Amino acid sequence: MQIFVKTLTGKTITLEVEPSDTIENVKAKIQDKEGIPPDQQRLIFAGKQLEDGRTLSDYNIQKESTLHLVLRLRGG
Template sequence: MASCICIVHSEQWPLMTFDATESDKVKKINEHIRSQTKVSVNDQILLLGSKILKPQRKLSSYGIDKETTIHLTLKVVKPSDEELPLFLVESSNEGQRHLLHVRRSSSVAQVKEMIEKVTTVTPKTQIVTCNGKRLEDGKIMADYNIRRGSLLFLTMHCIGG
């Protein structure tokens, strides 16, 4: 299988170079960029000339099918910092719900502090999930593609055995 060298240009970061194959999906390039820049895949736009590459498509669908060097341009779309009214569902308190007003730019740590104010459960003992994914400290709400009206679920660490 033929391979190609991807060179990604951006105004904000130094050149990124890595190998790919024609059968790789564009998302593989997006993930590589995310690992280098911490820009979420949803906030990236990759351009091949004037053509926007879609994450679910293979490189070969853009005519990249032989040993070649492809030059891509990375554009970063700043997520809107809209307010997201979310409901927090407590698993330990008969499913009690609390309305939280967070922003797309809110960190998970900030959200956990909000949760502590309404539930008295400390951030250290909180396990917060949304759409089946555990929210990790060091990330922001936009990293999880959380939308207004989403449900956050709160459970607590169980100590003992």
């Protein structure tokens, strides 16, 4: 199916994902469009942070779902 990813105030983008794929695949598919490396992208849904290991099925993701994208604030 298809999913939507939106920034705080920027445009919205569409990805072709399936429940089994890990968040790594979603981050990579985001990268091809914007170019942000996966290590820098922070993906959130329903106000809860996501993890690379888990997948859409783990986060009960479904069709026409909107996720929120942020750029990592590396601490050092």
